[PDB]
Ligand binder design. Structure first.
Ligand code: NAG
Ligand code: NAG
Ligand code: NAG
Ligand code: NAG
Ligand code: GLU
Ligand code: GLU
Ligand code: GLU
Lengths: 240, 58, 48, 192, 96, 192
């Protein structure tokens, strides 16, 4: 558009040789490749050399010079905030995106209750988990719970734990997080045999302890491990 | 795009409004060409023809 | 009792009105009155 | 002002032809057209070819630089401040986060399962959540689900509703999120 | 208009350029640092944030309907408000 | 004054300008970082601040007035810092205020104690001062065994010793007011 205005405006082409008289050769400095440079030269807050002479060309420069000024200081302004606020995430969030990459190898106990969830999973993402859990059966499927915990700290491995077992492994290891949602939703039924005489006797005793909440008064202190001072006061980082 | 993007309209409006004055520059000096020798319209052609001559770029 | 003739709740009685208007040099305030002298001291000196 | 000073300055009305010693027929560089594109070029911090040579004119644009130097920087700083604190905005991420925000009220569907559940919650956060529900009990605990859809959509209110309807709310209104997940998991059953 | 030629005159301006890089940049930095902490500055409006800052001497009147609301309170903020009011004494917990 | 004219000179300098445009705008943005996190620091002068930022190693005496207070405080932040003292031990509680003075002066340790001693701590050894405010109000009186016939005798004796005003007479005789000319009235702002 700078070349467009420069080839239609008459308040334009001015003769060189100022020291010498009239000299009817006709020249203006504008070409496309020049205007390829003056726009970039404006964009870098530099200016090539050229000062557009028509006011119509000065509309082309000045609005671009204004668009120059808006973008660049806005760039500095946000770039403080990333250094300042520092919204740090090692994110990868849901069931879907965590299955898009396999560095987040799905730790689950072989012949597990997690396995039985992934074996008969009917949700399309969770069904496709079972495609590559059994594939790297060697590596992606751990031998036990404590086995999967140790792999997460060493590798970038990821192991599946129950919500209240999550609760204390984050509590015993303060620099270790849960990532994602609440995938499974079941309970801890106390195990008696089939056709057991011990069902209702143990059943009401649980309900008698949940009456005062004995199970939770036990839960609040056995899941009270170390301190874990959740977030820490940061400091500005010289850029690396 | 939501954050700043109205400046692109303010960008483009500069490209809009410059059209009004660039054609304003042409016809007004054409009037001075039509004041001296030409009438109104045989002025406005003959410098526009040598704009197409365009004094070869490179 | 009988009836709430002047029914109400509780709010907080306070003002802290201390700031009104800077007005004066305040764009001066980011560096120092030491510096704005001493930076102009340098430019006066280096121009020689 | 640049033009007017350039009408009345001694070191203005200098000659054109800077290379020819002759041809004195005066040069008047700072026009009222040129003084437009001068100061705007400093206002956009690009500058024009025409710099002040007259000492009268040199005081003009030089302090006009100190106008633009401040304003563009001050434009940056509040923009750097505004974009900072909206990133410093971190909303509630827990019921425990929301059990303290008295300015952000919360109840439920009146006499629903939550109104039972929070009342019999021996979980220290949700226990105190019932106490807040106990206090403003007339205002909170609206008649139905729709009314608690309504008052979140007309005020600051949390409306401790149920997930199977929450996962319907986003199907129609994605104005409304799920801060936290599933205080207690239950099951729909048919009551004989 | 004038740039230096003559390496002697070049270097002087170039370091003088280097200085005015910093001071123009440094000014823009701490001006934000003022104007950021102004937006970080929050005039308190809730009792909630007021319940954590004991830097204001706040209280109520003894034996008050205001007071006994805090006294029987089971509420997160208003617990912490009534936590210190009985605990300091009438010094802040006035009679009028 | 120099000018790229052909493309090989052009494409270098503009990307060199694009190299340039980063660094200064990087540098301004990151010098902005090292100033805001100076100004969002905390002159922590309250117990509520001093509880939350687990930095200042904060302890007390075990077996003293202060321990029992925070053992029996019904104030949340004081309950919070008692939970720090519950999680900690003799590690920060060390004892016997002279054990407290040493860790404050040598380390980052903060020492929970009471007014008139901390007052007299400010008086000599001009490195230490009272950080914050007076939380509560106890009083130095005489311990008395239960139901002994001395309590009302000494209370008349102390009060008429205060009707002398001797308490504040031998105050400065046993506090000796001191030096330390306040030493701290600066460092708010203003890069210099
Ligand atoms: C993060 O670092 C730990 C060790 O510090 C390493 O085990 C882990 O693989 C790293 N995560 C990556 C590179 O994603
Ligand atoms: C507010 O202004 C009044 C009147 O000048 C003053 O007495 C008071 O101390 C000020 N408050 C402050 C400085 O916190
Ligand atoms: C809520 O969402 C609907 C559609 O999703 C939209 O029409 C409406 O404007 C939204 N309300 C608000 C307050 O944004
Ligand atoms: C304590 O103060 C004295 C004099 O003010 C000083 O010489 C000494 O170094 C200080 N102790 C420190 C800084 O640990
Ligand atoms: N669905 C609940 C009512 C709504 C609620 O409590 O969330 C019930 O069965 O009572
Ligand atoms: N209306 C209150 C007195 C005022 C107050 O305590 O705020 C009462 O009857 O106790
Ligand atoms: N005056 C305190 C003893 C000293 C202290 O604990 O600081 C008391 O009566 O327990």
């Amino acid at each position: 558009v700078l070349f467009v205005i420069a080839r239609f405006s008459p308040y334009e082409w001015y003769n060189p040789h100022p020291c010498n008289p009239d000299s009817d050769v006709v020249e203006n400095n504008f070409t496309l490749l020049n205007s390829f440079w003056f726009g970039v030269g404006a964009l870098m807050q530099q200016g090539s050399e050229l000062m557009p002479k028509a006011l119509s060309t000065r509309i082309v420069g000045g609005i671009w010079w204004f668009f120059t000024l808006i973008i660049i200081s806005s760039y500095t302004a946000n770039l403080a905030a990333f250094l300042t606020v520092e919204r740090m995430e090692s994110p990868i969030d849901s069931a879907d995106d965590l299955a898009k990459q396999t560095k987040i190898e799905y730790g689950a106990v072989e012949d597990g209750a997690t396995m039985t969830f992934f074996k008969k999973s009917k949700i399309s993402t969770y069904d496709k988990m079972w495609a590559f859990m059994s594939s790297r059966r060697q590596s992606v499927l751990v031998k036990s719970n404590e086995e999967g915990i140790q792999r997460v700290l060493t590798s970038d491995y990821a192991f599946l734990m129950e919500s209240t077992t999550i609760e204390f492994v984050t509590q015993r290891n303060c620099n270790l997080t849960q990532i994602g949602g609440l995938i499974d939703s079941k309970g801890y039924g106390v195990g008696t045999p089939m056709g057991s005489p011990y069902r209702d006797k143990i059943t009401i005793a649980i309900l008698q302890l949940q009456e005062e909440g004995k199970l939770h008064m036990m839960k609040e202190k056995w899941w009270r491990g170390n301190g874990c001072p959740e977030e820490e006061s940061k400091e500005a980082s010289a850029l690396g | 795009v939501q954050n700043i993007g109205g400046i692109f309209i303010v960008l483009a409006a500069g490209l809009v409004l410059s059209v009004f004055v660039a054609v304003g520059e042409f016809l007004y000096k054409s009037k001075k060409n039509a004041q001296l020798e030409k009438r109104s319209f045989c002025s406005a052609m003959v410098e526009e023809l040598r704009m197409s001559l365009k004094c070869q770029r490179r | 009792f009988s009836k709430p003739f002047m029914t109400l709740g509780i709010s907080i009685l306070y003002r802290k009105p201390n700031g009104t208007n800077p007005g004066v040099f305040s764009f001066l305030n980011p560096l120092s009155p030491d510096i704005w002298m001493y930076v102009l001291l340098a430019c006066l000196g280096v121009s020689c």
